[PDB]
Amino acid sequence: SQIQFTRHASDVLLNLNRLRSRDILTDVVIVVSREQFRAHKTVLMACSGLFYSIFTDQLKRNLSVINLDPEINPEGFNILLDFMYTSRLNLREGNIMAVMATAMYLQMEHVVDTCRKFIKAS
């Protein structure tokens, strides 16, 4: 047989987000300026070319802290971290530029492309 459960992936992602919200099995702290965000390395690697390229390297795979560029907008980062765990991207005229620049940095090409389609009608 070949049975597909169409809500399984989204249900897994929701439960991964629930674990993040309770700090269960999170294994990295992402530092952006004074802001610190706990996450699961596997989700970060699954959603970001930057985090994938960092954690794939055995020299950096076991790092518990990752200091990002301090010029990154923490609100921008948080929006993309939420997107990572929810499939929902919360863009506003007062964050599109920060979110598009931060998505570029994190190598989330499909979010940068959507930020472009977004500005093309803003």
Site of interaction with a second copy (CB under 8 A): 1-6, 8-13, 15-16, 19, 24-25, 27, 40-43, 45-47, 55-56, 61, 83-84, 87-92, 110, 114, 118
Q: Is 33 helix (H, G, I), strand (E, B) or coil?
A: coil
Q: Is 82 in the site for Cl ion (CB under 5 A)?
A: no
Q: Is 8 in the site for ligand E2E (CB under 6 A)?
A: yes
Q: Is 19 in the site for ligand E2E (CB under 6 A)?
A: yes
Q: Is 15 in the site for ligand E2E (CB under 6 A)?
A: yes
Residue 37: Cβ-neighbour burial (10 angstroms; 0-12, 13-18, 19+) = middle
56: part of which helix (H) or strand (E)?
helix 49-56
Q: Contact at 8 Å (CB) between 20 and 40?
A: yes
User: Which of 15, 21, 36, 56 is the binder for Cl ion (CB under 5 A)?
Assistant: 36
Please state, in angstroms and rounded to a whole number, the distance separating the CA atoms of residues 72 and 103: 10
The DSSP secondary-structure symbol of 45 reads: H
Binds 107: which of a second copy, ligand E2E, Cl ion, none (CB < 5-8 Å by kind): ligand E2E
Q: Which residues bind ligand E2E (CB under 6 A)?
A: 5, 8, 11-12, 15, 18-19, 45-49, 52, 107-111
